Amino acid sequence: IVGGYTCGANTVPYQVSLNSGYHFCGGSLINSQWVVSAAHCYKSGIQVRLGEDNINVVEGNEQFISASKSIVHPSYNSNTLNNDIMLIKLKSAASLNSRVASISLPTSCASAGTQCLISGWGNTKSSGTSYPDVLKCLKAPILSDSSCKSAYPGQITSNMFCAGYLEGGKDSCQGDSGGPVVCSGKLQGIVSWGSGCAQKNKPGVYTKVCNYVSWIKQTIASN
Ligand SMILES: N=C(N)NCCCC(=O)O
Ligand SMILES: [Ca+2]
């Protein structure tokens, strides 16, 4: 997260870190045994780390649970990043509490102008490189589909939206991949792609989660 702020320990209780020896992606806890992330975060040997603030220090609220299975969206295209969404099932149910909690799926899509909370452990620099240990947060509005399409000609599908600031300075970044965009208590987005971070006229692009709720629910019901 570039140009954001320190969230505060466990203030984003649905935020997960996906770990394969090291943090490599974010994710969102959606019930006691399932996490939503980006398909571009797919790999084998994932351990889901819940209740994290400082990802390099055991602080006392963590739950580490290995993934039993991952399900990349059936129509995920890694070249275009269309349908950039994946479900991860935990080997055991997380113990839900005030600091480890699921985030509600939307029943309605969000409109341009609505304010959202974007979070992660990604790069905090737009030019250089610095990775934070504690969770970073950014409040950002959803941008109009027309401004999103104008920013990235030929690249924005109906399964994507832009959020952030066309003036630059404030954005998600490398390592925030797969993490949440939460608006009015609903998971509306997944950190998907961009062109660098926090650059003028190049806001972050996010998977449009409301398009996938039916798939998420039916997948959970049979797995
Ligand atoms: N680039 C932005 N704005 N956000 C992060 C997307 C994932 C990435 O670039 O590695
Ligand atoms: Ca920790």
mmCIF file of C-alpha atoms in Angstrom, residues 2-171:
data_model
loop_
_atom_site.group_PDB
_atom_site.id
_atom_site.type_symbol
_atom_site.label_atom_id
_atom_site.label_comp_id
_atom_site.label_asym_id
_atom_site.label_seq_id
_atom_site.Cartn_x
_atom_site.Cartn_y
_atom_site.Cartn_z
ATOM 1 C CA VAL A 2 1.469 3.356 -1.109
ATOM 2 C CA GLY A 3 0.393 6.593 0.590
ATOM 3 C CA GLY A 4 -1.750 4.808 3.162
ATOM 4 C CA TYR A 5 -1.653 4.497 6.936
ATOM 5 C CA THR A 6 -0.930 1.899 9.608
ATOM 6 C CA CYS A 7 -4.281 0.120 10.129
ATOM 7 C CA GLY A 8 -3.753 -0.823 13.764
ATOM 8 C CA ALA A 9 -3.233 -4.383 15.006
ATOM 9 C CA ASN A 10 -6.168 -6.652 14.133
ATOM 10 C CA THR A 11 -8.460 -3.786 13.059
ATOM 11 C CA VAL A 12 -9.012 -5.576 9.726
ATOM 12 C CA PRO A 13 -9.940 -9.015 11.121
ATOM 13 C CA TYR A 14 -10.805 -10.589 7.733
ATOM 14 C CA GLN A 15 -7.358 -9.787 6.270
ATOM 15 C CA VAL A 16 -5.204 -12.875 5.759
ATOM 16 C CA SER A 17 -1.595 -13.359 4.719
ATOM 17 C CA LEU A 18 -0.872 -16.262 2.373
ATOM 18 C CA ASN A 19 2.490 -17.755 3.329
ATOM 19 C CA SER A 20 4.770 -20.183 1.452
ATOM 20 C CA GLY A 21 7.838 -19.633 3.648
ATOM 21 C CA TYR A 22 7.181 -15.887 3.411
ATOM 22 C CA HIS A 23 4.214 -13.580 2.804
ATOM 23 C CA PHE A 24 3.369 -13.563 -0.915
ATOM 24 C CA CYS A 25 -0.287 -12.475 -1.150
ATOM 25 C CA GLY A 26 -3.275 -11.171 0.743
ATOM 26 C CA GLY A 27 -6.697 -12.759 1.050
ATOM 27 C CA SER A 28 -10.071 -12.341 2.751
ATOM 28 C CA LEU A 29 -11.689 -14.737 5.236
ATOM 29 C CA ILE A 30 -15.325 -15.230 4.151
ATOM 30 C CA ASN A 31 -16.279 -17.985 6.603
ATOM 31 C CA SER A 32 -14.614 -20.253 9.191
ATOM 32 C CA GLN A 33 -13.060 -22.507 6.513
ATOM 33 C CA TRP A 34 -12.779 -20.442 3.291
ATOM 34 C CA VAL A 35 -10.584 -17.609 1.999
ATOM 35 C CA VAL A 36 -11.038 -15.552 -1.179
ATOM 36 C CA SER A 37 -7.938 -14.295 -2.993
ATOM 37 C CA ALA A 38 -6.700 -13.557 -6.539
ATOM 38 C CA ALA A 39 -6.168 -16.362 -9.064
ATOM 39 C CA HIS A 40 -2.768 -14.832 -9.872
ATOM 40 C CA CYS A 41 -1.842 -15.736 -6.258
ATOM 41 C CA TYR A 42 -2.299 -19.441 -7.005
ATOM 42 C CA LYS A 43 0.469 -21.771 -5.846
ATOM 43 C CA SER A 44 0.746 -25.066 -3.973
ATOM 44 C CA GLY A 45 1.832 -25.390 -0.330
ATOM 45 C CA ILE A 46 -0.125 -22.405 0.991
ATOM 46 C CA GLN A 47 -0.411 -21.737 4.725
ATOM 47 C CA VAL A 48 -3.128 -19.234 5.614
ATOM 48 C CA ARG A 49 -2.136 -16.830 8.380
ATOM 49 C CA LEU A 50 -5.029 -15.218 10.230
ATOM 50 C CA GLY A 51 -4.948 -12.650 13.040
ATOM 51 C CA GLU A 52 -1.723 -11.102 11.736
ATOM 52 C CA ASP A 53 -0.440 -7.613 12.235
ATOM 53 C CA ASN A 54 3.366 -7.815 12.185
ATOM 54 C CA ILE A 55 4.005 -10.726 9.784
ATOM 55 C CA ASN A 56 7.568 -11.178 11.127
ATOM 56 C CA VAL A 57 6.676 -11.415 14.848
ATOM 57 C CA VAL A 58 4.374 -13.804 16.724
ATOM 58 C CA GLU A 59 2.224 -11.320 18.651
ATOM 59 C CA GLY A 60 -0.411 -13.657 20.153
ATOM 60 C CA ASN A 61 -3.558 -13.514 18.002
ATOM 61 C CA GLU A 62 -2.390 -15.582 15.028
ATOM 62 C CA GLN A 63 -3.941 -18.725 13.646
ATOM 63 C CA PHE A 64 -1.826 -20.583 11.076
ATOM 64 C CA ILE A 65 -3.885 -23.088 9.068
ATOM 65 C CA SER A 66 -2.706 -24.986 5.972
ATOM 66 C CA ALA A 67 -4.846 -24.997 2.819
ATOM 67 C CA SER A 68 -6.516 -28.329 1.959
ATOM 68 C CA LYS A 69 -7.530 -27.219 -1.537
ATOM 69 C CA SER A 70 -7.449 -24.257 -3.880
ATOM 70 C CA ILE A 71 -9.953 -23.527 -6.633
ATOM 71 C CA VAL A 72 -8.988 -21.037 -9.324
ATOM 72 C CA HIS A 73 -11.988 -19.593 -11.167
ATOM 73 C CA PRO A 74 -12.912 -21.812 -14.131
ATOM 74 C CA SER A 75 -12.531 -18.888 -16.588
ATOM 75 C CA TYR A 76 -9.375 -17.282 -15.169
ATOM 76 C CA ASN A 77 -7.152 -15.947 -17.957
ATOM 77 C CA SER A 78 -3.629 -15.153 -16.723
ATOM 78 C CA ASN A 79 -2.812 -13.007 -19.782
ATOM 79 C CA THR A 80 -5.735 -10.566 -19.419
ATOM 80 C CA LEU A 81 -6.359 -11.243 -15.690
ATOM 81 C CA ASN A 82 -10.066 -11.593 -16.457
ATOM 82 C CA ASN A 83 -11.779 -13.540 -13.637
ATOM 83 C CA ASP A 84 -8.858 -13.017 -11.240
ATOM 84 C CA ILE A 85 -10.383 -14.840 -8.272
ATOM 85 C CA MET A 86 -9.601 -18.004 -6.304
ATOM 86 C CA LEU A 87 -11.024 -19.850 -3.297
ATOM 87 C CA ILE A 88 -8.843 -21.556 -0.686
ATOM 88 C CA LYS A 89 -10.267 -24.065 1.804
ATOM 89 C CA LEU A 90 -8.590 -24.385 5.206
ATOM 90 C CA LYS A 91 -7.661 -27.813 6.595
ATOM 91 C CA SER A 92 -9.449 -26.879 9.832
ATOM 92 C CA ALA A 93 -12.026 -24.238 10.744
ATOM 93 C CA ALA A 94 -10.615 -20.974 12.068
ATOM 94 C CA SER A 95 -11.721 -19.998 15.562
ATOM 95 C CA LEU A 96 -13.700 -16.827 14.895
ATOM 96 C CA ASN A 97 -13.378 -13.951 17.359
ATOM 97 C CA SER A 98 -13.089 -10.130 17.388
ATOM 98 C CA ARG A 99 -9.643 -10.248 15.714
ATOM 99 C CA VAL A 100 -10.264 -13.124 13.290
ATOM 100 C CA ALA A 101 -13.604 -12.585 11.577
ATOM 101 C CA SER A 102 -15.226 -13.227 8.217
ATOM 102 C CA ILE A 103 -16.194 -10.410 5.848
ATOM 103 C CA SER A 104 -19.665 -10.375 4.262
ATOM 104 C CA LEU A 105 -20.047 -11.031 0.547
ATOM 105 C CA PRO A 106 -22.021 -8.382 -1.330
ATOM 106 C CA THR A 107 -25.647 -8.947 -2.340
ATOM 107 C CA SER A 108 -25.424 -5.766 -4.431
ATOM 108 C CA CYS A 109 -22.554 -4.373 -6.513
ATOM 109 C CA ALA A 110 -20.950 -1.088 -5.422
ATOM 110 C CA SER A 111 -21.241 2.155 -7.390
ATOM 111 C CA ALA A 112 -18.541 4.592 -8.476
ATOM 112 C CA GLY A 113 -17.885 7.127 -5.702
ATOM 113 C CA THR A 114 -18.460 4.723 -2.813
ATOM 114 C CA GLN A 115 -15.560 4.753 -0.367
ATOM 115 C CA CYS A 116 -13.703 1.541 0.432
ATOM 116 C CA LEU A 117 -10.901 0.234 2.632
ATOM 117 C CA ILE A 118 -7.996 -1.440 0.853
ATOM 118 C CA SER A 119 -5.365 -3.226 2.932
ATOM 119 C CA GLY A 120 -2.182 -5.283 2.749
ATOM 120 C CA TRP A 121 1.492 -5.899 3.459
ATOM 121 C CA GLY A 122 2.655 -4.829 -0.015
ATOM 122 C CA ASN A 123 5.306 -2.346 -1.129
ATOM 123 C CA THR A 124 4.883 1.158 0.331
ATOM 124 C CA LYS A 125 7.021 2.952 -2.299
ATOM 125 C CA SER A 126 5.933 4.022 -5.805
ATOM 126 C CA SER A 127 9.508 4.150 -7.179
ATOM 127 C CA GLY A 128 11.768 2.255 -4.778
ATOM 128 C CA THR A 129 11.038 -0.765 -2.600
ATOM 129 C CA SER A 130 10.106 -1.031 1.076
ATOM 130 C CA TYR A 131 7.975 -3.771 2.600
ATOM 131 C CA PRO A 132 6.198 -3.065 5.883
ATOM 132 C CA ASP A 133 5.946 -5.567 8.683
ATOM 133 C CA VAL A 134 2.544 -4.331 9.911
ATOM 134 C CA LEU A 135 -0.719 -4.103 7.978
ATOM 135 C CA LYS A 136 -1.232 -0.941 5.915
ATOM 136 C CA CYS A 137 -4.579 0.609 4.990
ATOM 137 C CA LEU A 138 -5.877 2.997 2.334
ATOM 138 C CA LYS A 139 -9.282 4.632 2.054
ATOM 139 C CA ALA A 140 -10.145 4.998 -1.631
ATOM 140 C CA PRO A 141 -13.210 5.590 -3.807
ATOM 141 C CA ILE A 142 -14.385 3.353 -6.618
ATOM 142 C CA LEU A 143 -13.837 5.137 -9.929
ATOM 143 C CA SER A 144 -16.352 5.301 -12.774
ATOM 144 C CA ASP A 145 -16.142 2.516 -15.353
ATOM 145 C CA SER A 146 -15.611 5.134 -18.092
ATOM 146 C CA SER A 147 -12.612 6.694 -16.292
ATOM 147 C CA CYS A 148 -11.283 3.188 -15.580
ATOM 148 C CA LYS A 149 -11.555 2.196 -19.260
ATOM 149 C CA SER A 150 -9.978 5.514 -20.352
ATOM 150 C CA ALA A 151 -7.043 4.898 -17.978
ATOM 151 C CA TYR A 152 -6.454 1.401 -19.402
ATOM 152 C CA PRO A 153 -7.717 1.289 -23.008
ATOM 153 C CA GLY A 154 -8.658 -2.204 -24.207
ATOM 154 C CA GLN A 155 -8.022 -3.875 -20.827
ATOM 155 C CA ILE A 156 -10.952 -3.346 -18.420
ATOM 156 C CA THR A 157 -13.584 -6.094 -18.542
ATOM 157 C CA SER A 158 -16.983 -6.274 -16.854
ATOM 158 C CA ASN A 159 -15.261 -8.267 -14.062
ATOM 159 C CA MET A 160 -12.930 -5.400 -13.128
ATOM 160 C CA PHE A 161 -13.157 -1.978 -11.551
ATOM 161 C CA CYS A 162 -10.732 0.820 -10.749
ATOM 162 C CA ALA A 163 -10.380 2.334 -7.304
ATOM 163 C CA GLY A 164 -8.045 5.032 -6.032
ATOM 164 C CA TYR A 165 -6.893 8.426 -7.255
ATOM 165 C CA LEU A 166 -6.168 9.551 -10.827
ATOM 166 C CA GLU A 167 -3.719 12.142 -9.456
ATOM 167 C CA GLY A 168 -1.579 9.263 -8.093
ATOM 168 C CA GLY A 169 0.213 9.065 -4.733
ATOM 169 C CA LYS A 170 -2.212 6.595 -3.124
ATOM 170 C CA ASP A 171 -2.627 3.017 -4.370
#
